[PDB]
Structures are given as C-alpha cells and as structure tokens.
Amino acid sequence: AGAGFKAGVKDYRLTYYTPDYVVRDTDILAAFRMTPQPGVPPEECGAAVAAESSTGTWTTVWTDGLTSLDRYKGRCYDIEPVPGEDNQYIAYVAYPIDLFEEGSVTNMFTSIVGNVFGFKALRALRLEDLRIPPAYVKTFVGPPHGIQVERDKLNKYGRGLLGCTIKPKLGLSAKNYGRAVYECLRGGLDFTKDDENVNSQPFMRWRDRFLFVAEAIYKAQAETGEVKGHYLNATAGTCEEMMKRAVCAKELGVPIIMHDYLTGGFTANTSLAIYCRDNGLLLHIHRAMHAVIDRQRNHGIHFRVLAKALRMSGGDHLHSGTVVGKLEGEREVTLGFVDLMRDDYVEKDRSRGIYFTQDWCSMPGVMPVASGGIHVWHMPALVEIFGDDACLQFGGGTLGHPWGNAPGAAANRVALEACTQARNEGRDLAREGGDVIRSACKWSPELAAACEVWKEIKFEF
C-alpha cells in the first residue's frame, strides 16, 4: 500500500525510462547520440540523461513527494540502435514545456546540455536535434527582421547578396579599413564586414572604425546608386560595451551590425536582437567557435541545433558554411539546416539529419551566409545549393584579386549575376556550371583576371 520516501540510490530507468509515453504537442524533444560505458544498459544511460537534464539527481530525495514528478520529469521514450555501430544509440528525451523559461535560449541549453555530457556513465554524447514546439516558439521575440523584411528594407530582390570580410583580419587602421570598404562596395558588393575578431584593439579603436566605415558606406552608395551596408561588429567584453556600439551604429544611420553569438553568448545576443528589433537594425550573426562544439560526430552539439538556437535568440543572417570552401560542411546536412533556418515548416527527413518535424509558427526566417575560401569558380555551385535567399561572401576572393577591391567586387558581382540569369533561362547549374563562368570570363576583363588566378584552387581531401 502506497509510495513513500525510500532513501538510497536506485536505477534511473525506474523513473526516467518510459518507452510507452505518448509525446505531447508542447513537449521539447531531444535527440541524443549516446555512447554508454561498457556494461551500462542503453535504457539506463538514456534515463540518466533524461533525469539529470530535468528533475533527477543520483540518489532519491524526499522533496519529490511535495511535487508531481509525473508532470515535470524528463522522459527517455525511445532508443534506436545506430547502424554500423557497436556501442552507439539515439536516445529520445521529452521535456515538458513547464521546465523552461519563456524566451530564454540560455535556459533551454542549461537544462538540455548542462551537465549530462560530462557523466562518467557515458563515453560520448552528441545532441543532434531538438523539436521546439510552437507553444515554446511563440515565447521568443526571434529574429529582428527575417529574410522578407530584410529584402524589403534593403530594396534587393531576385538574387543572392554579396558580402566580403575585409583582410588582413587584424592589423588595419580605421582609415585603411574604411578605404578598403569603400573600394569593395563601389565594385558591386552589397555588404562588407568586420572580421569576427575585429572588435576594439590598439591598432584600431571601434569608434574610429565605425565613423570611417560610415563614410565609406555613404560614398559607395552615392556612387553606385545601390543600397550599401557594412556589418560593424558589436561583439564586446560586456553588455554595456556591446550596447554602446550598437547605439553608435544606429546613431550613424548605418543599416546593419554583427554579433558573434557563441563567443559573446546567448544572453548578450538576445539582448542585441531585441535592441535591433526596437531600432530597425539588421543583425548579422557570426558563428565563431561553433566548430569547437559541432565538428565531431561522436560528441558535442550538431550545428543544426545551434542554428535553431540562433533563430530563437535572434538574428537576420547566420553563417551556414560553404560546403565547397575552406571549412567543413557536408552537402546533404547543410541543405537540411538551411531549410531549418529559412522555412516555416520542415518535415522530418533523416537522410538530411532532421530528426524532428519543426514548425516555426511564423517566426521569421534567418538568411544563410556562405563564406570562407570561396571564389568565382564556386559561384554556380553556391547559387545551386542556396538559391536567391542567401548571402555569399568573398574575403580573400575580393581583396585577393590582382587589380584590387573594386575590380574584385565587380568580378564576383558579374559571376553571380551570370549564374542567376543562366538559372533563370533554364540552364542547369549543376552541369553547365563551368560553362556559364567561362562564357562570362571571355566577356568581362575583371572576372577573367579573377578566373585566371584561382582556376586551380579547390578544397577536397
């Protein structure tokens, strides 16, 4: 008769493994790639994860009886073995909505990826996907603007956007920075940007940069008659500094700033997105440090999770990787998380790493930004992968051009405009790719000088 307080350790699986559980429409779902220690039953390991990321600790506590553990517990509700793997499972955990602070990515991560990864009882853990239900989604302000509104504000339609990280990363003075910026922007690029690590430094103080870049933006815009932007960096050591810089950007009238959301952090980031919403600034998100977390298959958090996260925290652009450039990015998975970033509704599709149907319930879309070791030859591949709603960025691929930045910019702009026309004309970019580029080199002297220099250059291993 009953259920009272019994001191002492017991198995987690007794309370936290519930394979007969029907998931509710409002539950947050997690998909873990679990790798138990030898002799730890999968069922127990999964229940541990569910427990210690929700309501449970290592021994039985009496305070449980004061509340309804049923209502609040995390629940491991399914375990798939991984094909071609001895000791690897996908554990499915369901967390009630009540477990989470409204509007707080920080709180969601704290529960779900807070402690469990460090458990002795497992060898490795990797969070592959989360299902953020509508009812939790609706608690977030989310992106300041989103793709449609961005395009409307900037008055740019029917093609990808072109960007460009000024180089060298560090070392340039403010005056030189603006100089480069002006030259890239007048050649036909839509945007330039601070390098992710360009903040405020002895060689270049941020307010000097902001002023000179503003002047570059306005000169280039008056010269070309096309709207121009430069992502001034608001990443800073303190929120107060980060805000100071956003405010200055607003005060200059410039259209767009950028934040390194993972090195700055989710708290700081949500703050900035709210500021950007409140003042009409576009917010470009750089994913500095993601690869520390998302590179390995056995351990960490997969980027598609870090991308859902940024979409909730807030951003107008997020770096999505290139597939073909200098940094890793498999094609099928990339197509998947780009859909996750951009679309309203994304059906489960395991071939693409999407473990869950994600309904974003009208939260605006984030624009993927493909950047890093790309040049003109990659253009058709890029237009083919991403479509119009992306932004392509050529740092080296612009300031590396033999004729300088304006010619560099011009090259890339022609390259992109050519593929877009071709695509529109019916030409299949996956096959006739090299042809479209070649036609355009024999046509444009600037593009030609570009093609010539990076013809041999590829990233395959």
Binding site: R151, K250, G253
Partner: protein, 140 residues
C-alpha cells in the same frame, strides 16, 4: 590592371552588371516568372525619383536606420494576378514604355506565399540619362 570608374557609373540592382537584356533575354525571364506561378508587375519613376536618397530624414530624430526615399516606384496599372500569359506581359511592357518614354521602367514579380518581391530588373532607362556607363567603358 584596369581601374573601375567612379564617374558616372550608376547601377540598378539585379542584372545591371551584365550586358543589357535583349528583347529575347527579357522574354526568357518572363517565362521563368510564369513558369513559377509568380505575379508580374511593372513599376516606373521619372529621372529624379529613381535613385535612393534621404531628404525626408531632415524631419527625423535618430531613427533614420534603413530609411531611404525612392524605394517605392509608381505602379503600372495593377499586378497581373493568375495571368499565366507571357505574351500579355510583354505587351504591357510596351504599353508602359510607350506612355512614359522618359521614365525608368522595371519589371518585378511577387511570390504571394512568402509575400515578397521575388525578382526585378530594369527594362527602360530614359534617353536623357547621362549617369550610366555602357558595359565596356566601366573600366579604363
């Protein structure tokens, strides 16, 4: 080493970095528009109201971020809803350029699902326009 000219090399968004579109390259884009179900539309502006500026920002506080005048052009009739006829679009381009021989004129298409303009390129530059360059004299 060729130098890209600052005078007077004013561009016009999508496709203005390619060679000017032939009457048939224009028709190819219209096929792509009707192929995808998108709504076609024509917009026009006189020589002044064509370029992005900010003279209304004299009335503003510190709130002129992503505000520029002359984003909006003037709508030619209405957008052509479910009008799946490539011929009839090209006819309207003609009717329009005819009524405003001195205007900038552009063709645009709306996707109504995403609710956004999905493409747009220039079809007529006025004859008096002295602020653009032919595709070959852009670098000296």
């Amino acid at each position: 080493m060729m130098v890209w000219t600052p005078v007077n090399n004013k561009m016009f968004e999508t496709f203005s970095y390619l060679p000017p579109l032939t009457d048939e390259q224009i028709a190819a884009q219209v096929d792509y528009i009707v192929a995808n179900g998108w709504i076609p539309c024509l917009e026009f502006a006189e020589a002044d109201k064509a370029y992005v500026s900010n003279e209304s920002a004299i009335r503003f506080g510190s709130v002129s971020c992503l505000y520029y005048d002359n984003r909006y052009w003037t709508m030619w009739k209405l957008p052509m809803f479910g009008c799946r006829d490539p011929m009839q679009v090209l006819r309207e381009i003609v009717a329009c350029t005819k009524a405003f021989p001195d205007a900038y004129v552009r063709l645009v298409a709306f996707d109504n699902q995403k609710q956004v303009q999905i493409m747009g390129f220039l079809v007529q530059r006025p004859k008096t326009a002295r602020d653009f360059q032919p595709a070959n004299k852009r670098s000296v």
